[PDB]
Amino acid sequence: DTIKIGMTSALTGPYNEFGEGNRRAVELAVEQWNAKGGINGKKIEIAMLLDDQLNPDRAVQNIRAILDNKDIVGIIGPAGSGPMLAVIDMVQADGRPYMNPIAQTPVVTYPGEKTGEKPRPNVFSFALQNDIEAVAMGEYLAKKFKRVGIIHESTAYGVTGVDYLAASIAKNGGAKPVATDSYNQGAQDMTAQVARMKRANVDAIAAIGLGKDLAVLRRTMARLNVNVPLAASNGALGQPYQEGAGELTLGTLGTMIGAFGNPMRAPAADFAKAYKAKYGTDRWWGNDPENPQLFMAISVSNGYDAANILFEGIRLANSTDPKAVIAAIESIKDYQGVNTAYTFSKERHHGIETDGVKVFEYVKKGDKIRLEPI
Ligand code: NA
Numbered sequence: 001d002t003i004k005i006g007m008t009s010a011l012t013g014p015y016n017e018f019g020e021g022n023r024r025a026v027e028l029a030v031e032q033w034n035a036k037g038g039i040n041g042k043k044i045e046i047a048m049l050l051d052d053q054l055n056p057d058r059a060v061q062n063i064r065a066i067l068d069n070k071d072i073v074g075i076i077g078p079a080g081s082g083p084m085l086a087v088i089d090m091v092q093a094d095g096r097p098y099m100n101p102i103a104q105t106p107v108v109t110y111p112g113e114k115t116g117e118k119p120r121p122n123v124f125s126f127a128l129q130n131d132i133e134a135v136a137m138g139e140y141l142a143k144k145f146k147r148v149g150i151i152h153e154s155t156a157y158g159v160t161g162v163d164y165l166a167a168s169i170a171k172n173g174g175a176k177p178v179a180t181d182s183y184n185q186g187a188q189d190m191t192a193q194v195a196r197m198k199r200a201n202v203d204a205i206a207a208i209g210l211g212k213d214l215a216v217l218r219r220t221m222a223r224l225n226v227n228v229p230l231a232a233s234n235g236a237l238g239q240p241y242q243e244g245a246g247e248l249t250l251g252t253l254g255t256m257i258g259a260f261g262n263p264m265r266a267p268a269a270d271f272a273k274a275y276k277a278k279y280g281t282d283r284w285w286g287n288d289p290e291n292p293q294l295f296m297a298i299s300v301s302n303g304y305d306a307a308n309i310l311f312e313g314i315r316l317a318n319s320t321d322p323k324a325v326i327a328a329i330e331s332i333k334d335y336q337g338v339n340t341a342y343t344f345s346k347e348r349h350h351g352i353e354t355d356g357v358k359v360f361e362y363v364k365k366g367d368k369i370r371l372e373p374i
Contacts, residue, residue, distance in 0.1 A: 003039050003314060004047040006066035007076040008059060009101075010083075011051035014186065014212040017238045017299050018079035019051065021284050022101055025303030026076055028278055029311070039314045047071065052078050054185075059083035060090070067094050073320040074099070074310050076303065081105040081157035092120050096322045097313060097329070099306035100125040102298065104133065104235070105156040109349050119349040122326050124309065126302040126339065128234055128257055128352045130161045130208075135354050137255045138168020140374070141206060141231060147178035148231075149202035151193050151217060153209035154184045161208035161233060178202055185213055194220040206231040215244020222248055229253060234298045234357070237371075239283060250369050253361040257297035257352065259339045261360075261373060271301055271338045294360060294371050301338035305351070309335065309342060 007026060010019030030044050038044050048066050052058035059078045066072055067090060074097045077084055084103035091098050100108055100123060109125040112118035115132070141148050150165065152158030159182070166177055179200035181193045194217065197205055205228060207217055214236040221227060232241070232254040242249050259268040272292045276285060284300050286293030313329035314320065327346075335342035342351040359374040 001042065003042045003044040003073055003311075003320070004069075004071045005044065005074045005076065005310070006048040006050075006069065006072040007046055008050040008052050008062035008066060008083075009076070009078045010054035010080065013053035013055075014240065015054040015079070015210055017211065017240065017283070017295075018102055018235075019054070021296070021299035022076070022079060022303030023049070024275075024279060024284065025300045026307045028274060029304055029307035031278075032274070033308075033311055039311050040318065044311065052083055054078070054080045054083060056080070056082040056086035059087050063087040063090055067091070067096075072096070073314070074325070076101060076306055076310070077103075079103070080155070081108065082155045084108050085156055088120070088123075092122065095122050097310060097325045098123050099310050100127055101302045101306045102235075103127050103157070104130045105160050106131050107156070107160075115350065116348045119347065122322060123349055124306070124329055124344065125350045126306045126309075126352070127350065128298065128357060129350060130157070131164045132352065132354060133161070133233060133255055133357065134164035134168040136357050136359055137206065137231065137233070138165055138174075139172050140253075140255075140359050141204065142169045142172030142174025145174075145203040145229070147175065147201060147203045149179040149197040149200055149205045150177045151180075151190070151197070151205060151207050151209070152182050153213060154182045157235070158182055158208050165206060165208065177206075183209070183213065185210065187213070188216060190217050190220040191224060193217075194224045194226055198224050198226040202226075202228055204229040204231055207236055208233045210235050211238030211240035212244065214241045218245045218248055218252070227251075237295055238299060239295070247369060249362045250364060251362065253359060253374065255357050256294050256360055257302075257339055257356055258294070258358040259297040259301060259356070260292045260294050261358065265336070267336050268301070268338050271304060275300070297339050305337035305339050305342070309337070
């Protein structure tokens with residue numbers, strides 16, 4: 001028989017770069033492990049694959065349906081702080097191994113608010129956490145800019161992200177942000193928010209949120225003739241950003257998981273080869289056939305690392321018993337993942353650290369705007 005896993009994520013809708021990218025990631029992994037026998041001779045199947053569109057209510061309905069199935073031995077959870085936090089108690093109760101690929105809110109994994117101390121026992125995160133992200137972004141802004149304005153989405157991703165970022169700015173001796181506010185995902189009117197910035201004479205605007213929404217922010221900026229550097233979070237720089245913003249992406253900068261920047265580590269380099277072999281120069285690869293785009297780390301290979309690690313836990317436990325698998329994953333030290341080396345412990349359930357992140361900026365060559373290392 002088989003190893004059955006469940007998965008729900010934003011497969012359709014405004015934020016489907018995450019869910020569908022992660023879906024692709026997991027399928028490829030399954031194939032790879034499957035080509036060589038499965039996990040200790042047991043073929044892996046994604047028995048339940050569900051779409052929540054990044055909606056928290058749908059996530060719950062989807063996780064309810066997955067948990068109900070007794071044959072599922074593990075889960076790749078949804079993209080989004082909303083979906084994740086919404087389902088997190090149901091999952092912690094059930095107690096089967098649960099991979100958080102994307103959601104950056106620290107309490108998702110460490111309810112005790114101490115990163116690397118007292119995690120939810122069955123939750124393993126492949127996110128770039130907000131407090132971790134705040135370090136690089138905090139530093140860059142606190143040295144480059146005088147009055148920063150911050151805008152963020154209303155979910156925990158935006159909420160925590162800002163407290164982590166404002167603080168990281170203070171810590172690097174930068175001045176407290178001259179303007180702040182939240183929007184709710186989907187919000188079309190940010191003129192209100194971009195006007196507060198414009199009137200606050202910001203040096204720059206830092207945004208924590210997602211591509212579709214970031215694009216609106218930037219278009220609102222040009223509409224209000226507020227043209228200053230836009231410093232985005234990793235998740236903001238997705239495909240919808242550039243499609244919505246077009247050539248106005250020039251001058252947007254961001255912190256990003258750097259797995260696909262040159263020079264790549266071997267496993268990032270090898271993954272890229274397998275990905276193109278399977279999917280081609282697709283939406284996630286991007287429009288350079290020679291170079292996979294940077295955003296793949298947060299849209300695809302986190303899903304990849306999550307799958308491979310879950311499978312590795314099973315391989316090492318020699319069972320599908322949750323508590324066992326949980327323990328096994330904790331055995332895994334020095335795992336060379338695509339996005340980072342993984343070294344879990346009974347108390348450390350995340351992997352990515354600042355060395356996996358750099359600051360990039362949209363710059364142009366000829367008539368072509370490219371992300372490049374700061
Ligand atoms: Na493409």
